[PDB]
A paper describes a structure:
They catalyze the addition of the N-acetylglucosamine to the N-acetyl-lactosamine repeat as a key step of the chain elongation process. Among the characterized B3GNTs, B3GNT2 is the major poly-N-acetyl-lactosamine synthase, and deletion of its coding gene dramatically reduced the cell surface poly-N-acetyl-lactosamine and led to hypersensitive and hyperresponsive immunocytes. The luminal domain of B3GNT2 comprises an N-terminal helical domain (Pro55–Cys125) and a C-terminal catalytic domain (Cys138–Cys397) as well as an extended linker (Arg126–Lys137) that connects the helical domain to the catalytic domain.
The acceptor substrate LacNAc (Galβ1-4GlcNAc) is bound to the top of the cleft and more solvent exposed. The hydroxyls of the Gal ring are engaged in direct hydrogen bond interactions with the side chains of His282 and Asp333 and water-mediated hydrogen bond interaction with the side chain of Tyr300. The Gal ring is also stacked against the side chain of Tyr289. In contrast, the GlcNAc ring is only involved in a water-mediated hydrogen bond with the main chain oxygen of Gly280 through one of its hydroxyls. And superposition of the B3GNT2_UDPGlcNAc and B3GNT2_LacNAc structures shows that the acceptor substrate LacNAc binds right above the donor substrate UDP-GlcNAc in the substrate-binding cleft. The hydroxyl group on C3 of the Gal in the acceptor substrate points to the C1 of the GlcNAc in the donor substrate at a distance of 3.7 Å. Ala279 from the β5-β6 loop is less than 4 Å from the acetyl group of the GlcNAc of the acceptor substrate.
Author numbering: 55 to 76, 89 to 397
């Protein structure tokens, strides 16, 4: 394949699959992979995020700076894992106060972690470390690893989180992974999980699943991917705004990540890992990752049969949550 990622992924496949039979690590090589400047045509004219992605692609052994090791001391029914960024204090607090509160109704334990990388001063981020410690001490729901938290490193956020599940929360029945700007009807998710047979629950993976997508080739677009980096279609994948899957599948996904090179778009990467597992993510109508009709955004009854809606501001998540608590009496 002319495209770099495809070409390197095929090499991964043959080293994991003897049937294809007829040398730096791809997992813990953390010096720059200088070969990429020779083999990627036009490397020097690529945007900086692509250069950094290609150079350090073979490094994923980053450590936890802030951990909450007893977060799953009690076997959770549902683990909420919310991708966030250091400066988003308001987003995390609104989630804490609304749909992301930890609870134990009916002995079905819901626990919450926020997933962060570093926002270092060398990348011109303002220094908010003392406030992050303060937040972490008080609320004990911050997981932070020491990699550069960037758009193109969100696959790392995925792999490192899945590594944390296998080491520190392997008994959770279900996992919800989402962004910090979505509203999530946590009651409706609990009801949905309790209506699942165990056969169906075993390999559960549902979201707003996208079929037959391809890399955007427009150089101005957020999700632009040049032809020299990737070719072909994307596998089916749930939009990263939020998806829901079993803890048993989380263990299997973690194991399979070693066999899939990181990809700059994190929700495609999870789709690549599912496909390698022989699984197809399941589209569920309750995931509105492109939001609902504006006429309906007003009426709280519009949110009752929803799993999640993107996107909502901190104030709106709290307001929707408060109205939702009395939704059974007027809908
Ligand atoms: C995902 O997250 C990971 C982890 O945080 C990021 O990986 C880091 O990427 C940064 C670059 O953004 C790396 O830092 C760079 O290292 C280069 C090479 O350093 C080695 O070689 C020099 C010389 O041989 C040695 O002195 C050095 O000690 C190392 O042995 C530097 O050349 C880089 O630039 C430096 O000089 C330039 C001048 O052009 C200055 O502008 C810079 O500020 C800097 O001083 C830079 O230091 C870092 O090593 C990576 N960390 C790890 C653990 O691998 C990914 O970048 C990130 N991915 C995305 C897409 O964001
Ligand atoms: C079939 C098709 O092309 N559908 C597109 C979606 O791919 C696209 O979704 C976004 O895609 C990027 C990767 O390119 C990233 O995964 C985002 O999370 C995901 O939302 C959507 C918006 O570009 O449009 C659909 O038409
Ligand atoms: C990953 O492991 C290698 C080999 O043990 C080591 O050289 C490297 O520093 C590690 N990377 C990080 C980010 O710790
Ligand atoms: C919940 O668990 C407690 C043990 O802590 C048990 O005594 C109780 O019967 C359980 N209640 C329900 C409704 O499951």
């Amino acid at each position: 394949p002319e495209a770099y990622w495809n070409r390197e992924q095929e090499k991964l496949n043959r080293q994991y699959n003897p049937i294809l039979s007829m040398n730096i690590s791809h997992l813990n090589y953390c010096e720059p992979d200088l070969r990429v400047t020779s083999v990627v045509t036009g490397f020097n004219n690529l945007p900086d995020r692509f250069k950094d992605f290609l150079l350090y692609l073979r490094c994923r052994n980053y450590s936890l700076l802030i951990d909450q090791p007893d977060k799953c001391a009690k076997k959770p029914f549902l683990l909420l894992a919310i991708k966030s960024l250091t400066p988003h204090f308001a987003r995390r607090q609104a989630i804490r106060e609304s749909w992301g509160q930890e609870s134990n109704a009916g002995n079905q334990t819901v626990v919450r972690v926020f997933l962060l990388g570093q926002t270092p001063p060398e990348d011109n981020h303002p220094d908010l470390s003392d406030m992050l410690k303060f937040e972490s001490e008080k609320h004990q729901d911050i997981l932070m690893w020491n990699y550069r938290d960037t758009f193109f490193n969100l696959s790392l956020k995925e792999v490192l989180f899945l590594r944390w599940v296998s080491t520190s929360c392997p008994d959770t029945e279900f996992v919800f992974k989402g962004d910090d700007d979505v509203f999530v009807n946590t009651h409706h998710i609990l009801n949905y999980l309790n209506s699942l047979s165990k056969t169906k629950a075993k390999d559960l993976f549902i979201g707003d699943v996208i079929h037959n997508a391809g890399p955007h080739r427009d150089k101005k677009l957020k999700y632009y991917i040049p032809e020299v980096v990737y070719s072909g279609l994307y596998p089916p994948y749930a939009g990263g705004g939020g998806f829901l899957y079993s803890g048993h599948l989380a263990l299997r996904l973690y194991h399979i990540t070693d066999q899939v090179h990181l990809y700059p778009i994190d929700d495609v990467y999870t789709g690549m890992c599912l496909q390698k597992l022989g699984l197809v993510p399941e589209k569920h109508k309750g995931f509105r990752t492109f939001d609902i009709e504006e006429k309906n955004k007003n009426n709280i009854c519009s949110y009752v049969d929803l799993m999640l809606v993107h996107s909502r501001k901190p104030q709106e998540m709290i307001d929707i949550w408060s109205q939702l608590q009395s939704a059974h009496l007027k809908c």
